[PDB]
Every structure is written in structure tokens, then in C-alpha cells.
């Protein structure tokens, strides 16, 4: 059959996705054991492995199509008929939204991400928003405080599958009660109850219980991060009940969660209540469905673009000397394209830059580096581009632009969450907002360093400030691993004094970072360590000794050991 | 008064320089014992840079101390400091380097600096401290080798001393026959030669018929026990271990010239410069190599010519017909295809110079203002020089000056070799070509433009990469599968399937490649290598045929 081939391909693609998501779940399933045996280097390798799964299976499916069709995998009318058959397979399939993403990826491979039209692939979903039926398996369990909250929480902690001893179980329970009472007041507390997700959300050294705390006045997040003693005993480090704290825990600058989710769209829907600020793409990316989040983000971009009456402009701030960065005035994302030629001092390849972006992508981002989404042959309407930006694009990125009459195609760019560059933020805020910004800036350095990321060019212009006031690094092309750096004490005179590649003089940092009397004093007060090579070496040594530094996705004040010790 | 102060400042600088050279070298044992392989790598980078640092310091000292006859008197005072001085040959090199910095490598004459040595050669004298120890088999060879192995200073336990000893006995017996073995002994150098993950015992195997190399490479278990991976007793094998395409050895040598002399008996093919460069005296090797060049030039009766093979589109390459080196100068303008800087090219040569060359990349010696006699230059080459390298040439009447060039050991370009060699020799060449790729890939070097014309074949048949300006790190590359039936490219993209067009177009060669190196056309193979690199693993590299490993030829 000519029609058999069309169906064989459609079933091949869908089979690939069946397997891909099955392997995604199998890797994720192993998060508990990795946590239980504190194999923190297995945890990090698992995040890289799971990140690579989708592209692998897309690749396999494409080579299968290549060998099966013997040429027609490039025929477009053929693959438009495959798409019709594939579309008709989706109404019964549970993960249909991601099945469309997987087909999209296969299509884009076949045609080098060219010729993307709404008829040839699922730029938009082919299925209605008719998915709110009662979930085949409950994804959460209700817990009411019929016998009070002490032995409510003592069942919840009891039902956890974790196979380790608790350091002091009821101590932690009382901590949680203190927080809940101080927050709701005893009367309302006894009226409210929990609905907690049945799967734990794992990240690095933490196992997060994620619930909804439903109260008279409304429903709130309920997050308990579970950590491990150096010995191997479990404790709950805190309790977060604000949407703001939850937004940060599920933040774009953190590694994705490892959470066993056979129906991700259902888990995504359930999370909306406690994450009302997140787009659908952001929620999918928070539970690890990164590639589907890409699909959803291009849709979010299209929605915004068509309803905005603004043009693309260069992003405000200090112009990059390797990246060209533009945005839409009201849009929450930036577009970053690598320049054709970098400043004449700078001897590095565009490929190095791309490699640094991939390094960040599969690293523990530790709440301090933004997630990026790489796009190839991104298409823009000429009419949507500021004349200022269009002139810039053709000066600096000409080799990456091709004309298509009323449109252009950018060969390669990254999409990143938009922030306020810190060099602008520090000119905008005073007193306490300014203190908190410098605290966060220095903490950004420290946490990246302890995670074996040396930021390289640490100037304020290379950090961004989020909606919740957090400082996040985004200039990735001078990153190196901490272990690759040679920290030295005496700064060179500023010829005959020997300095070799990889030499860093933290004492030199104070010249840039304390030049402004509004800022220096504050940096000195809180981050003087950052000017001592011995401090950096200490972090370097702990890293070489295999140690992995704890990271708290919330203020240190909120730790039970702190606010109640 | 200054003239003597200057001579003493320079000589003092060298005293410190070589002292710091030994101290970096001193730490090779501990680095090996604790398998700190990235410490090994950085110590090689550090030690390579030591000399230029100390020259820089001395030059800044001389500058702050603020004629032509003047510096002939500085040189005369310096010369008078040398007759007792033990490492005088390198002291002369160090003076030469200080002079060249002060004078931007201009006006180099035999009177103004030590183009040739000021002292009579001293290989006559008895070494003040023995550098090697004799070992006779009075109680047989089983407990001879257990004496040397026990006497080693290495502080680790052995996987199986007695096995490794038996292994070595098999080799010696199979090589000499039980009779010649009995009237034979070892003279083994007292310092181990450290390189990457190996500690080499280096000896002389003295037989009735003559003297032979005796090399035992000492390796480490993944857990940390010592074993001897083999025993090499041919000069050819020794020449390869000390080859121009391998990293220098780290070997404690208080009298480097004495060690060079001792090394001559084994390794009889190497120039003096090559022996100095094999034990890490890279800058002094440059001095000795310009002397070797001058010697050859005066006795040759031929002119400089463009080097045989495919003309380079970024480098211009010439040589002397009977000479063992090529000169490579960066072109003024590159072919319109290649979008790159002279600075990129210089950077890639610098990458290779301080990289573990892993036996697959040639060492280069950079020269500034290299002076040639016009009468020595072929009219063909002279036209090429002025067409392609005009900005780098200045006229000085009867001579020209090349601003910048690299000198490299000369080989037969592989595209020529493959037209010369057949059957088994041809199989061996393609085996080596693919292994050069593989070994470079595992060392995080992506060769870039891997066509045969960019590799050379050595005197001993080994394939060595020499086109450095398209090198990049494996970790910087994005290996991709080709979309079916053109398609274009994002930064770093490489399509290993495309290799087949170029590398298998010839029916004499392609088939042999598929047989032995089909992996190299599969994106999965390269991606696998990429990951092993990122997951921190460092690939073993054996400076000898895999067959010769004891675990293989005896297990
Ligand atoms: N996530 C972001 N949000 C807002 N602005 C950004 C973001 N990333 C980059 N920019 C802006 O683009 C510029 C260049 O970004 P950067 O990644 O630092 O490129 P380069 O390496 O060329 O300096 C910055 O100075 C800043 O103005
Ligand atoms: N070590 C060498 N031995 C012999 N010939 C060489 C050597 N290095 C370069 N060549 C010759 O010079 C040419 C250009 O060398 P290469 O380094 O590849 O320059 P390019 O980068 O311009 O290709 C080669 O095609 C070959 O003929
Ligand atoms: N240039 C592009 N324009 C719009 N969508 C794209 C583009 N490239 C990839 N995508 C979408 O991103 C998702 C993942 O693609 P890929 O990264 O190719 O696996 C799919 O939904 C694709 O259709
Ligand atoms: N252009 C040159 N011609 C001849 N010899 C040189 C040249 N440049 C450097 N040398 C020699 O190379 C050795 C090291 O020099 P340098 O690279 O300047 O440290 C010294 O013996 C120098 O005399
Ligand atoms: Mn920047
Ligand atoms: Mn940058
Ligand atoms: Mn070449
Ligand atoms: Mn080249």
C-alpha cells in the first residue's frame, strides 16, 4: 500500500514517543533510591541522562523513517498524509499533547527545522481543551485533621515511602504546627486541611513533599523539603505556605524536578492552583518536560506577538560583545543570538559559546542560572522588527540571517526568561531593596562557586533580577569549572609579571565591585570573603573532595533550625 | 661596573630558572603516586612556561638597571663566568634569550650572543654524580629484576611483582636466547621518566653483541597498584617513546647534558636538540636546533623550496631538500573560504604546544625575525614568499627577514605516502591514520579538517597531525546525523557521515577504512567519546603497539 506506508510511519513515530516517555519515567522512578543512598553524583548524572532522552528517541525514529521510506521521508505531501493519520490516533492517547510535540520534533529533523507551517505539524494543538475528566488514578490524597494536626502530619510523614530513619520526627511535626498556627491562627487552622501530591518532587539533595493547604479564606501552597543529615537521617527543613516562596521553589533558575508523572498534563493542572504565576510552559518545564515546554512556549510567543502592537527592540542594558539580545517591550522573554564577530580582544569560537550554554543547561543551576531554549531557524516578520534592531541584526548577525521576502530566518538563537539587568536595578533601588540586592548578588557568586561554576565575568551587567527580587547569572560564555581555575593572591601590576590562562586574582575584584560608595560598603559588609583567594580555594577543595553543597530555595531565616532553634 | 652586574644578574636568573625547573620536575613522583592526572597536566603547562617567565624578570631587572662594545663586554664577562659552571650550555641559551628580548630578536650575530657555544665540549669528563646504576645477574635475572623493582622509590603496592618479573624474563629470553641472556646486564637510569599516567624506567640492556634500549613503563590500576605494562628493547621502539610527537618527559636532571649524552647510546637517531627536547629542555633545544640548521645549511648545496604536497591555504611551507624540518609561515590573506584570523592560527599552535600531544601532533618551535640569505632561496619560493607573505618579509639587501614562522619536524604528507605504499604497509598506514583520529578525539582534540594531506608519516611509519588551524576541542563540537534528502549549520555542527565522501572516494583506501574505522563515520561514536571526556575520563595511550602489552601477548 501507498497508504500502508503512511500508517506505518505514523505508528512508528507514536511508538517512539511511547518508548521515550516510558524511559523518561524509568529514569525518574530511580530518583528515590539515588536520594535514599545519598548518591549525589548519581543524582546529577541522572538529570543529564534524562535531559538527553527525548532527542535520542527523536533521532532513532528519524533513522527508522530514513531506512523505512527509502526517500519519501522527505516528500512533503507524504508527510502531510502521515500527519493526518497521526492526528487521528490522538483522541484516545493519554499524553496526546506531548505526542504532538514528539511528532513536531521528528518533522523538524527531517526538514532541518525548515518549512514549519500549521498544516504540516502541530504548531498548535489538534485536540480541544476537553481534558478535565476525573483522573483515572488520583494524583493526590486528602488529609483532614479529625484527630488534630499532630497525628495528621504523623500519618503524612508515615505514608512517605522513604526507607531511612528520621532524626526527630515529632520535633519536625511541632515545627510544622508552629508555622501553621502562627500563619492561620488556631481557629482557622483547625478548620483547614491538606491535599498533598502522592509523588515526591526530587532535586539534588532534597525530597520535596508538595501539597495544597486548603483554608477557610482560600487554598495555599504547602511545601515541605525533606533533607538528610550527614549521617543519613531524615528531617523537614521548613514549611512554605506562600505563593511567592512556591514560585521560587519551582523557579526558572532551578533544575527541573524529578517527579514520577504518568499523566503530566494532570499534574500540571493540579499545580496551577499553588503556582498561579506560571505559564503552562513553565509548569511543564518545572516537572522536567523541557521539550514539550518548548512547544508550549512557541505557542505562548505566538499568542503574545499577535495581540501586542509593539516591535522587537534590542533589550535594555549594556550591549553584549558576543551576544545580540532583543525582546518585545511587554514580553517576558529575551532572544539571544551569537554575533558573527566578537570584540577583537576576545579569541573564542561561537561553538565555545554554544558549548557553554549546553554546559549550563545540563548542570545543577542551583537557582542562579536561567534556563535557555535553543531554537534553530526562528522566523520573524520584517514588519515586526524595529528599524533600529533590523540594522543591528544585519550588521552583527548577517551570517545567521536569511531573507524570505516579508520574513527573515535566524539560524540559531536562545530564548531566556527576561529579567532586569542588575546594573540597571542597582540604579533604581535604595536602602533595604538595595541591601537585599547586594546580598543576593554575592550569594549568587558563592552558590555558583560552590557548585563548581566560576562565573568568569562577574560584573553586575551579567546578572538579572527576577520578579521576586532574586539575582540570577546569565552571561555564560566565560563560565569555567571551579576546578579549572588557578586562584592567586598577589594581583599583577596594572608585563614582566607572569600571568597564565586560568589565573584569577579575587583581590582584584574589589576594584570593580566596590567602586561606587553606594555599593562597596554593602559588599564589604556581607561578602568580603569573595575577595580572598583562600575562600575560593576552600570551595575548590571541597569540590575536589567530592562534596556537594546544600542549597536552600528559600530564605535562611525560614529554616526551622534557625527560626526555632 | 654595570657590565659585570649585568652578567651576574643574567647568570643569577638562570640559576633560579633551572632550580625552579627541577622543583616542578621533582614533584612528578608524588603527582603520579596520588594519580592526580590534572596536576600532571598543569605541571607540564607550568614547566613549559617557566623559562620565558624568568627571562622576562631578568629583562625587567636589566631594564631598570638602565653601546655595542658595552654588550660585547657583558658577553665577555658572562663568558668568563662559565668555565666552572656546570650547566653552561643552557646558561648560554638563557643569555641568548635575554639578549633577544632586549633587542626584539634583531641583530643576532655570533659576536653579540652565543649563536654557537663559547666553551669546548665536555663530554670527556667523569660525571660528578653517577646518573645510572649497573645491575649484573649474579643470582640470576629473576632476583635481579626484583632488586631494581624493589629499589624503586615509588610508594605503592604492586598488583603482582613476581608476574611482571616473569613477563620481562619471557621477553628477554625470547629476544636474546637463554645463552646470551646470562652474559648480559642492565644499566638503568636512577631517575624515572614521568609522562601522563606512566612512570618509565629507562635502561640500557648490555649484551655480548652490543647495547640495546631497555624500557619498562610502570602504570597504575584503577584502584592504585603498580604494574609493568611491557618491556621494549628495540631502538625503533625507544625512538617512538621519546618521539617528537609526544609530551616531554619529566625526569629529574641536575646535569641535563650528561643525561643527553647517556641517552645517545639508546636512541642513536635523535639530534641533540631532540634529546634535550625529550627531557623537557625545550628552549635550549631551540638553541641547539638553530645550530643544527646552520650546520646543515653551510654543507648543503641546495636552495630553499616550497615543501612537497598540497599547498596550504593558510600556511606557506618551505624546506631544504635534504633537511629534516619544515618552516611554516602564516599567510597574509587566507583563501576567501576560510574566515579566520592570524591570531586564531597562532592560538591553535599555542593550544597544541601546551596540550598532551598524545603522539599524534608535532611539536613546533616558533621563531621571530628568522633571517635568510636571498641567494639561498629558490626563485619559485621567493615569488611565493612575496606573493603570499609580503607583510611578513623585510628586505635587507643580501638577506630577507621573516617576521614570524614555525619550525616543525618534517614528515611525508600522508596523501603522498598512500600513493607510495601497498599491501601490508598500506594497511598499516590506514590503521595508523584512523588511530591518530581516535587517539586525538579521546584527548579532546577534534582534528577539524581530517583529510590525508593534513597528516604526516614519520620515519617509523607513524601518522601525525600537523594542520592546527581547524582544531577545536571535542567538547565544543555538536555532532549531528544528516537529515535525509541542502541543509545548513549552527555553530559547532559536524556531520561524521560527510567524512565518507572525502575519506572513502578512492577504491584502494575506502574499503580498508570501513574495515578498521567504520565507527568514525557514526555520530554515536564521537558523541560517546565526547561524553567519556566530559565524565572526566582520561584515555590510556600506549607509546607502543597494543600487541606488546604483557596482558595481551601473554594473556
Ligand atoms: N535574561 C535576560 N534578561 C534581560 N536582559 C538580558 C538577559 N540576558 C541578556 N540580557 C541583556 O543582553 C546583554 C548581553 O547579554 P550577555 O548574555 O551578558 O551577552 P555577552 O556575553 O555578549 O555580554 C546584557 O548586557 C543585557 O543587557
Ligand atoms: N610536518 C610537515 N612535513 C611535511 N610537509 C608539511 C608538514 N607540515 C605541512 N606540510 C606541507 O605544507 C602544507 C600545508 O600545511 P598545513 O599545516 O596543512 O597548512 P594549511 O593549514 O594552510 O593547510 C601541507 O599540504 C604539506 O604539503
Ligand atoms: N524554529 C522553530 N519555530 C517554531 N517552533 C519550533 C522551532 N524549532 C522547534 N520548534 C518546536 O519546538 C518543539 C521541539 O522541537 P525540537 O527542539 O526540534 O525537538 C516542537 O514543538 C517544535 O515544533
Ligand atoms: N630569529 C632567530 N634566529 C636565530 N636564533 C634565534 C632566533 N630567535 C631566537 N633564537 C634563539 O633561540 C633560543 C631561545 O630564544 P627565545 O625564543 O628568544 O627564548 C636562543 O638560543 C636564541 O638565540
Ligand atoms: Mn555580558
Ligand atoms: Mn559574555
Ligand atoms: Mn592543510
Ligand atoms: Mn589548515
Numbering used by the authors:
A (entry chain A): 1 to 494, 504 to 574
B (entry chain B): 4 to 69, 75 to 493, 505 to 574
What do the authors say?
In this work, we report the crystal structure of AceK in complex with Mn2+ and ADP. Two Mn2+ ions were found in the active site of AceK, which is different from the previous structures. For the two metal ions (designated M1 and M2) found in the catalytic center of AceK-Mn2+ the catalytic core displays an identical position of M1 compared to AceK-Mg2+. Two ions (M1, M2) separated by 3.9 Å are coordinated by the conserved aspartic acid residues Asp475, Asp477, and Asn462, ADP and water molecules. Each ion is hexa-coordinated by oxygen atoms from protein residues, ADP, and water molecules. The environments of the two metal ions in the AceK catalytic site differ; Mn2+ at M1 forms direct coordination with the carboxylate groups of two residues: Asp475, Asn462, which is the same with Mg2+ in the AceK-Mg2+ structure; while Mn2+ at M2 forms direct contact with carboxylate side chains of Asp477 and Asp475. In the Mn2+-binding site of AceK, the two metal ions are both bridged by Asp475, whereas Asp477 is only coordinated to the M2 metal ion. In the structure of AceK-Mn2+, the M2 metal ion indirectly interacts with Glu478 through water-mediated hydrogen bonds. The calculated numbers of binding sites were 2.37 for Mn2+ and 1.36 for Mg2+, which indicated that there is only one Mg2+ (presumably M1) binding to AceK WT, whereas two Mn2+ (presumably M1 and M2) binding to AceK WT. Results of the enzymatic activity of AceK with Mg2+ and Mn2+ revealed that the phosphatase activity of AceK-Mn2+ was higher than that of AceK-Mg2+, whereas the kinase activity was almost unchanged.
